[PDB]
A paper describes a structure:
Glucuronoyl esterases (GEs) within the carbohydrate esterase family 15 ([name]) esterase family, in a range of aerobic and anaerobic fungi and bacteria, have been identified as playing an important role in breaking down LCCs by cleaving the ester bond between 4-O-methyl-d-glucuronyl in xylan and alcohol groups in lignin. GEs share an invariant Ser-His-Glu/Asp catalytic triad and employ a conserved catalytic mechanism that involves the formation of an acyl-enzyme covalent intermediate, which is subsequently cleaved through acid-base hydrolysis. Rumen GEs adopt a canonical α/β hydrolase fold: FsCE15, PrCE15, and RfCE15 adopted the canonical α/β-hydrolase fold that is seen in all of the GE structures solved to date. The fold of all three enzymes consists of a central twisted 10 stranded mixed β-sheet flanked by α-helices on either side.
Crystals of PrCE15 belonged to space group P61 with a single protein molecule in the asymmetric unit. The structure of PrCE15 was refined to Rwork/Rfree of 22.9%/26.9% using data with a maximum resolution of 2.54 Å. A similar examination of these resides in PrCE15 putatively identifies the catalytic residues as Ser226, His355, and Glu249. The catalytic residues of FsCE15 and PrCE15 are positioned in the canonical conformation characteristic of [name]-B subfamily with the general acid located on a loop at the end of β7. FsCE15 and PrCE15 have a conserved disulfide bond between residues Cys345 - Cys483 and Cys225 - Cys356, respectively, which anchors the general base within optimal hydrogen bonding distance (2.7 Å) to the catalytic serine. The arginine following the catalytic serine in the motif contributes to the stabilization of the transition state, and while the arginine is conserved in FsCE15 it is replaced with a tyrosine in PrCE15. Interestingly, it was more common for this residue to be tyrosine in AGF GEs (26 out of 35 sequences) with arginine found at this position in the nine remaining rumen enzymes. PrCE15 displayed a multiphasic unfolding curve however, upon reduction of the disulfide bond, PrCE15 unfolding was monophasic with the higher Tm unfolding event no longer detectable. We determined apparent steady state kinetic parameters for PrCE15 and RfCE15. Both enzymes displayed similar affinities for BnzGlcA; with PrCE15 and RfCE15 having apparent Km values of 5.0 ± 0.4 mM and 6.0 ± 0.4 mM, respectively. The apparent kcat of PrCE15 was determined to be 22.3 ± 0.7 s-1, compared to an apparent kcat of 91.2 ± 0.8 s-1 for RfCE15.
Numbering used by the authors: 22 to 408
The structure:
């Protein structure tokens, strides 16, 4: 079989860093870059061990051009569970940072699957969809302060611990904090009966982008569920440039992302060696399900829909396309899932987090349409050898 999840945050840390051309020497790839093409233009992924390194090239490209580098695991990490609260103490190069979450543990001997919500248990999905889960809220402000002015708070605890990261995007702090939570859950696992092979992550809107980066950048996340992530999330920068008045390089904020993206690629997103379809593909071969809301134009769902279809090619290539699913539909308020969305994702929570043999074969339901073949025609229908 193809792994559904991995024991380590990054199985490909041993891979060789890709070439990273200066922005002005970057080729103009006007449609969506080829996710299987090595960063140096020298061919295409062949097997699973290759995909891990291509995943790490995508990671390195996203870190280099728009987020900043996720720190490696810290030198020291101590987690404790007392009074319903998990507290995680991080030590690295003479600094400290502490995370604290009020978690809720199901009754019984276990083990229990895990759901990490952004700023809440279960995020913007209902507690009922995870009534049988360990529920761990990620209080993101304990790493970087959420805000919607395009300005950064360099005194937040992450930036105090890595002061030379004050140019990095806030999404790299948040991804790193989610990986520190999972570190602490691992440490206390036998005490709360956590099943480390069934951890999910979810959030909506800004919290949707947070969940996308969080699970893309951590291979111990067995199901990544961004909800209405919009521009800067599942949406491709390129396609969002072709539609109008959406979140895109021109108007997003440059504290969550690096100012370098605007300065080097605004009006020239064809020059990016990557796009966000490959951010989604960093989750492959693990399970992925996302929700759209075309009723809000600011989310740019034609770009999200397009980029999701592009990402699916990576699951197809590995013969696991039933681990990828979405649902685009209107008729619901932002961050409150439509009825069909609650049902669709519940099939994914059952199979990939609860372990039931539900089927998930073709859940690509969307009231949004777009010429997505136009964006992926060059590279498409590739396949990878799975041993």
């Amino acid at each position: 079989e193809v792994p559904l999840v991995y024991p380590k945050e990054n199985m490909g840390e041993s891979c060789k860093a890709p070439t990273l051309p200066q922005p002005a020497s970057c080729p103009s790839v006007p449609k969506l870059p080829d996710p299987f093409e090595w960063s140096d233009g020298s061919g295409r992924v062949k097997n699973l061990a290759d995909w891990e390194c291509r995943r790490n090239e995508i990671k390195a490209e996203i870190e280099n051009y728009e987020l900043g580098k996720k720190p490696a695991p810290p030198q020291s990490l101590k987690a404790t569970y007392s009074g319903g609260t998990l507290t995680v103490v991080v030590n690295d190069n003479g600094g400290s940072l502490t995370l604290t979450s009020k978690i809720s543990v199901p009754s019984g001997s276990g083990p229990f699957p895990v759901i990490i919500g952004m700023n809440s248990n279960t995020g913007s999905l209902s507690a009922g969809q995870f009534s049988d889960f360990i529920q761990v809220p990620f209080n993101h402000d304990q790493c970087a302060q959420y805000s919607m002015t395009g300005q950064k708070n360099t005194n937040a605890p992450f930036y105090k611990l890595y002061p030379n990261l004050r140019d990095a995007g806030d999404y790299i702090a948040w991804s790193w904090g989610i990986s520190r939570l999972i570190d602490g859950i691992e440490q206390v696992k036998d005490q709360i009966h956590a099943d480390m092979n069934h951890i999910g992550v979810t959030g909506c809107s800004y919290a949707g982008k947070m969940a996308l980066f969080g699970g893309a950048f951590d291979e111990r996340v067995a199901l990544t569920i961004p909800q209405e992530s919009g521009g800067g999330g599942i949406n491709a920068w390129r396609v969002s440039d072709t539609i109008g008045n959406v979140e895109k390089i021109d108007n997003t904020n440059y504290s969550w992302f690096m100012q370098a993206l605007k300065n080097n690629f605004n009006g020239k997103s064809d020059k990016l060696p990557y796009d966000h379809h490959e951010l989604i593909a960093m989750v492959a071969p693990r399970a992925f399900f996302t929700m759209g809301n075309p009723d809000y134009e600011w989310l740019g769902d034609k770009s999200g829909y397009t980029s999701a279809m592009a990402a699916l090619e990576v699951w197809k290539a590995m013969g696991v396309e039933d681990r990828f699913g979405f649902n685009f539909v209107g008729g619901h308020m932002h961050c409150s899932a439509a009825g069909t969305q609650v049902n669709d994702v519940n099939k994914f929570i059952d199979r990939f987090l609860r372990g039931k043999s539900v089927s998930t074969s073709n859940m690509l339901s969307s009231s949004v349409t777009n010429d997505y073949n136009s964006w992926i025609a060059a590279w498409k229908g590739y396949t990878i050898d799975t041993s």
